[PDB]
């Protein structure tokens, strides 16, 4: 009933290999029964749940900023394989609720 598609910034990220890369997923909740998921489009062409909070490869992490709406989707020690298209999604724990998919973003790993 409330269309609250999270925002997922920035659109493109360039980081040198070995440097930590962090995104920002912002979701304005209507209830506290909700989870945020961290997705990448695998070579299988599928949304791979990289991490999620509330709670894998610890190299992809998700942190809740104490502001109440913004979470940091972070990939430590970024590797050239990590390049691709990512997104975040929030699932309200409501009886029939589902996934609200944010817009996608790109990560690019350099030398």
């Amino acid at each position, epitope marked *: *009933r*409330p*269309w609250n*598609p999270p925002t997922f910034s920035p659109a493109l990220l360039v980081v040198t290999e070995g440097d930590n890369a962090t995104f920002t997923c912002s979701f304005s909740n209507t209830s506290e029964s909700f989870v945020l998921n961290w*997705y990448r*489009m695998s070579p299988s*062409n*599928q*949304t791979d749940k990289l991490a999620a909070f509330p709670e894998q490869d610890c190299r992809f992490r998700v942190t809740q900023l104490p502001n109440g709406r913004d979470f940091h989707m972070s990939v430590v020690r970024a590797r050239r394989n990590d390049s691709g*298209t990512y*997104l975040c*999604g929030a699932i309200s724990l409501a009886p029939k609720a*589902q*996934i*609200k*998919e*944010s*817009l*996608r973003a790109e990560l690019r790993v350099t030398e």
Partner: antibody, heavy 118, light 108 residues
Framework: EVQLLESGGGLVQPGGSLRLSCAASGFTFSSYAMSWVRQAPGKGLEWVSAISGSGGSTYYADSVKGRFTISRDNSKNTLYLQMNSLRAEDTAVYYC???????????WGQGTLVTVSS | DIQMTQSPSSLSASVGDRVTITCRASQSISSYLNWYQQKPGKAPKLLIYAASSLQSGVPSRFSGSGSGTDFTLTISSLQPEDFATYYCQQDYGLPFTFGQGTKVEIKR
């Protein structure tokens, strides 16, 4: 230059089924959500269905709930709407519209006309 | 639902006149409202997004303004090819709702 075109519309009888397709080009089809919107002649526009980018979540209006099913193929870059138990009210030209999440219906196809008559 | 009432239903103005279309919502939709141009027998065209932002490729004469419930579309200098029907739609919540529609007619 995003291009969207519909296909599969024609004369359908009360009840029965009919499948609609929307061929997408000019953008990455998986990145933005897709939706359907119908408009009976001499009537306003009506939201009917919507599907997420990956397709993990589908959304339906209460009028078409339990009868229409929206679906997506990402390799073919095409949006499908499987319409079941069609009624005379369902007669309308349906448009496939890309969704920028909030800025919904950002681009519109010309739409295909579905006639529900015996 | 978020009831959308769009006033007026039709209007007639000559070339170069300031036209005004009012979109009124049942519940507040923040700034999530979009304006669409539907020429007769054609697909709708996005004009204004986020209540007041102007879509690329849309002439600057179309202007959007609105906060809360009532938003407004305004054409600076009406042109002959601007004959179309204009709808307002919210992006706040489901189900997505449009207005009745306002038919703008050119005067000659």
């Amino acid at each position: 230059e995003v291009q969207l075109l519909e296909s599969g519309g024609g004369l359908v009888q009360p009840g029965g089924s009919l499948r609609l397709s929307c061929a997408a080009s000019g953008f990455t089809f998986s990145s933005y959500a897709m939706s359907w919107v119908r408009q009976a002649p001499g009537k306003g526009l009506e939201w009917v269905s919507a599907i997420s980018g990956s397709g993990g979540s589908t959304y339906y209006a209460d009028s078409v709930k339990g009868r229409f099913t929206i679906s997506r193929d990402n390799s073919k870059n095409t949006l499908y709407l499987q319409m079941n138990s069609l009624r005379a009210e369902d007669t309308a030209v349906y448009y496939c519209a890309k969704s920028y999440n909030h800025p919904m219906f950002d681009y519109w196809g010309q739409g295909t006309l579905v006639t529900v008559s015996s | 639902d978020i009831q959308m009432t769009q006033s007026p239903s039709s209007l007639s103005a000559s070339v170069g006149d300031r036209v005004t279309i009012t979109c009124r919502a049942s519940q507040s939709i923040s700034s999530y409202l979009n304006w669409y141009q539907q020429k007769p027998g054609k697909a709708p065209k996005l004009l204004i997004y986020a209540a007041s932002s102007l879509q690329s490729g849309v002439p600057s004469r179309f202007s959007g303004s609105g906060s809360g419930t009532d938003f407004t579309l305004t054409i600076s200098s009406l042109q002959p090819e601007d004959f179309a029907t204009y709808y307002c739609q919210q992006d706040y919540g489901l189900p997505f709702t449009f207005g009745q529609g306002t038919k703008v007619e050119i005067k000659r």
